[PDB]
Amino acid sequence: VHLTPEEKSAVTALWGKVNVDEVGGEALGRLLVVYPWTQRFFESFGDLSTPDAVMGNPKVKAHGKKVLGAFSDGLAHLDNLKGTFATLSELHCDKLHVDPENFRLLGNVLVCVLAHHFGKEFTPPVQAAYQKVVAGVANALAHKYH
Amino acid sequence: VHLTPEEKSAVTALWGKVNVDEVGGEALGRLLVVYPWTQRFFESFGDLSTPDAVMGNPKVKAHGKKVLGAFSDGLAHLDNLKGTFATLSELHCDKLHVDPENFRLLGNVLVCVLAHHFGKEFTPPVQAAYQKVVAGVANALAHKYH
Amino acid sequence: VLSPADKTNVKAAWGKVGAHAGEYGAEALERMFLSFPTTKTYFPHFDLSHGSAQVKGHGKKVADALTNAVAHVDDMPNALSALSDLHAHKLRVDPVNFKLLSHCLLVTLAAHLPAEFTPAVHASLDKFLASVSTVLTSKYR
Amino acid sequence: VLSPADKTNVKAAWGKVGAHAGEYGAEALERMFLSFPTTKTYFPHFDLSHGSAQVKGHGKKVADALTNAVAHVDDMPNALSALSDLHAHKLRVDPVNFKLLSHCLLVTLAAHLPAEFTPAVHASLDKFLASVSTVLTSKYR
Ligand code: HEM
Ligand code: HEM
Ligand code: HEM
Ligand code: HEM
Numbered sequence: 001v002h003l004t005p006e007e008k009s010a011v012t013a014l015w016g017k018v019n020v021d022e023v024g025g026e027a028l029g030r031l032l033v034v035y036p037w038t039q040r041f042f043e044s045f046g047d048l049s050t051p052d053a054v055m056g057n058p059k060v061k062a063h064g065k066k067v068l069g070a071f072s073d074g075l076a077h078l079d080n081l082k083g084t085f086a087t088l089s090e091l092h093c094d095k096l097h098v099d100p101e102n103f104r105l106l107g108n109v110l111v112c113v114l115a116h117h118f119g120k121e122f123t124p125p126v127q128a129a130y131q132k133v134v135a136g137v138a139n140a141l142a143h144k145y146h
Numbered sequence: 147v148h149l150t151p152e153e154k155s156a157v158t159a160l161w162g163k164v165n166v167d168e169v170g171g172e173a174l175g176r177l178l179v180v181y182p183w184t185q186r187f188f189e190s191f192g193d194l195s196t197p198d199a200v201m202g203n204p205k206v207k208a209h210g211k212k213v214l215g216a217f218s219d220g221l222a223h224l225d226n227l228k229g230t231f232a233t234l235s236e237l238h239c240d241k242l243h244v245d246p247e248n249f250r251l252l253g254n255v256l257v258c259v260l261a262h263h264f265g266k267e268f269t270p271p272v273q274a275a276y277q278k279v280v281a282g283v284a285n286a287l288a289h290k291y292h
Numbered sequence: 293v294l295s296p297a298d299k300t301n302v303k304a305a306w307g308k309v310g311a312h313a314g315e316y317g318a319e320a321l322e323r324m325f326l327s328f329p330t331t332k333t334y335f336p337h338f339d340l341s342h343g344s345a346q347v348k349g350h351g352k353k354v355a356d357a358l359t360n361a362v363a364h365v366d367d368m369p370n371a372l373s374a375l376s377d378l379h380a381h382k383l384r385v386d387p388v389n390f391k392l393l394s395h396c397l398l399v400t401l402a403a404h405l406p407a408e409f410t411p412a413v414h415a416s417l418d419k420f421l422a423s424v425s426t427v428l429t430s431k432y433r
Numbered sequence: 434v435l436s437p438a439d440k441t442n443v444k445a446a447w448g449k450v451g452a453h454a455g456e457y458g459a460e461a462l463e464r465m466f467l468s469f470p471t472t473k474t475y476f477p478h479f480d481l482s483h484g485s486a487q488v489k490g491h492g493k494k495v496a497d498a499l500t501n502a503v504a505h506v507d508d509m510p511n512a513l514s515a516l517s518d519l520h521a522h523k524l525r526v527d528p529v530n531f532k533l534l535s536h537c538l539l540v541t542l543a544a545h546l547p548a549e550f551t552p553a554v555h556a557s558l559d560k561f562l563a564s565v566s567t568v569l570t571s572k573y574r
Binding site for chain 1: 330333380383384385386387388429431
Binding site: 175179180200201254257258261262270277 | 412414
């Protein structure tokens with residue numbers, strides 16, 4: 001993914017403010033609430049009955065932190081996303097058989113979470129940069145389908 | 147795309163029986179009728195006002211031939227679909243900006259056309275083989291998007 | 293959203309299915325299982341073999357549900373609520389799967405009703421199936 | 434298909450937008466144009482620059498239609514018929530573009546109404562926008 005220097009600066013500056021212990025959990029929870037068929041993949045997580053149960057799930061938050069970590073990894077290797085996410089692509093595609101549209105949904109909910117936490121600062125140009133990154137990650141994850 | 151010898155045989159054998167002058171136009175025509183937003187790409191074709199008008203359009207039938215020719219090309223090079231469709235990918239992605247879901251729709255309507263034409267001969271296993279081919283083609287056309 | 297023309301097309305074509313309903317239903321499932329093997333995942337405890345009586349039986353259920361949808365075209369959510377519950381709430385079927393079965397049903401219909409499967413009817417049938425899929429993937433109760 | 438609670442959530446959330454509906458629709462458009470440049474293709478005759486007055490006026494239009502839709506939640510096809518005509522029949526907008534706009538709208542709302550943008554409201558608005566999108570992309574008259 002090619003980011004202009006200004007874009008990279010914008011991306012980085014906002015990412016420096018993200019609460020690493022919370023955002024991925026927020027994102028994963030919202031995916032499970034907004035697109036409920038995704039719960040099928042996390043039945044082992046326990047109670048996902050309601051919005052509150054989902055958002056309050058410890059397993060959801062723990063897992064969310066792992067997800068965020070993968071996004072941080074991507075941000076540092078935008079040049080080589082397919083290589084960086086090779087193992088995650090095999091897991092998601094070959095083993096779990098997650099439909100690739102789901103990768104797109106999670107990236108978009110992540111964007112909605114950033115907008116939620118950063119309001120004012122999440123300007124159109126900042127969102128545009130983040131849309132490239134998230135499309136990049138989604139494409140790398142779906143590589144095995146390609 | 148990898149077809150077992152058995153699958154390639156099945157595909158191959160049926161394809162030699164396809165009316166290359168007509169099947170492509172039927173397929174393009176049905177894409178335009180079934181998913182009408184696709185017509186926006188063929189405005190220069192004239193009268194696409196009614197199913198009747200789409201199906202009897204000379205430009206649709208002529209263009210249909212070209213599309214089918216591309217599928218025949220894929221069949222002959224299942225090996226290097228990506229290499230084979232490189233120029234077509236560039237046309238469709240970077241010159242026309244066709245959303246990739248549209249490639250899958252055309253692939254599926256072709257399948258419907260084959261079923262309509264061959265009746266009982268278009269068996270479940272024959273379809274399965276054809277689905278791998280159509281997905282391979284759509285994936286090769288979408289390459290520039292990946 | 294279906295046009296009056298759509299509803300008429302659908303009633304006419306589905307009507308021609310008749311007592312073949314179940315057979316057509318079973319064939320569509322077998323087409324799905326072979327073409328998109330990932331769908332088998334939702335049927336862990338089925339005998340998905342070639343002339344499986346389980347699939348034939350299920351095919352009949354699917355076909356009857358479509359007949360039901362046709363005979364309640366104007367108020368589907370109310371007529372298919374129990375099916376939404378099963379598919380959406382209990383099974384949590386990824387919506388992509390509905391596109392696969394819909395496609396396999398269209399293929400089946402094309403292979404069996406050559407005179408009825410005109411571009412206009414193909415268009416209405418696709419729209420109808422997308423309508424049904426939307427109901428079955430939604431949690432509206 | 435929307436549940437009764439979805440309907441309540443949308444009405445409530447849309448209520449909080451109120452006076453800013455217009456500014457929000459304009460921002461949503463701007464976000465879409467920047468983030469998904471291919472969408473600009475439908476507006477060749479538009480000044481798509483930052484403070485473009487055209488986008489601002491167009492944002493109002495979009496927002497007014499959503500307000501109407503919220504008001505006619507149980508009756509969208511009837512309410513939006515003219516808009517369906519324009520988008521589906523005249524402009525022939527590819528349905529993917531409705532997902533892009535819907536997403537940009539959610540982002541705008543999340544950005545401006547953080548307290549109101551709870552998981553449940555987010556879920557309800559997403560379904561609402563999908564329903565609007567379905568109406569606008571189908572020809573049924
Ligand atoms: C941007 C998209 C995504 C990213 C970056 C991502 C990242 C990850 C990461 C880092 C893990 C942990 C791997 C490990 O065990 O070391 C994981 C596991 C998993 N992911 Fe994702 N994921 C994404 C999308 C999804 C989606 C959309 C789904 C399903 C709807 C999904 C389902 C799963 C499941 C079920 C596991 C569990 C594997 C296990 O715990 O055995 N993921 N993902
Ligand atoms: C499997 C999918 C497809 C295949 C194999 C295919 C194949 C082709 C071929 C062989 C050409 C002619 C290039 C030449 O002039 O030599 C072409 C052109 C074109 N295709 Fe496709 N196509 C596919 C899907 C689509 C879709 C889904 C759309 C739009 C909805 C589309 C829109 C066009 C247009 C607008 C042109 C015209 C360019 C021109 O000839 O001036 N194609 N395609
Ligand atoms: C047009 C769309 C569909 C229709 C009309 C439909 C209809 C039905 C019906 C009537 C039943 C049986 C309920 C009963 O016991 O009375 C059923 C069950 C089921 N359906 Fe579907 N279905 C559709 C799509 C799908 C798809 C796309 C999948 C997943 C790939 C799926 C997976 C299942 C499963 C797993 C069961 C339960 C079987 C069992 O455990 O006995 N369905 N469906
Ligand atoms: C939430 C979904 C949408 C709604 C409620 C909506 C609403 C509207 C409204 C109210 C108008 C002007 C009607 C009039 O007063 O004549 C309009 C026009 C238009 N819309 Fe949309 N729209 C939506 C999505 C889209 C999308 C996704 C696109 C393409 C990316 C699009 C492209 C257009 C265009 C090109 C026009 C005509 C502009 C002109 O020539 O002035 N719309 N829309």
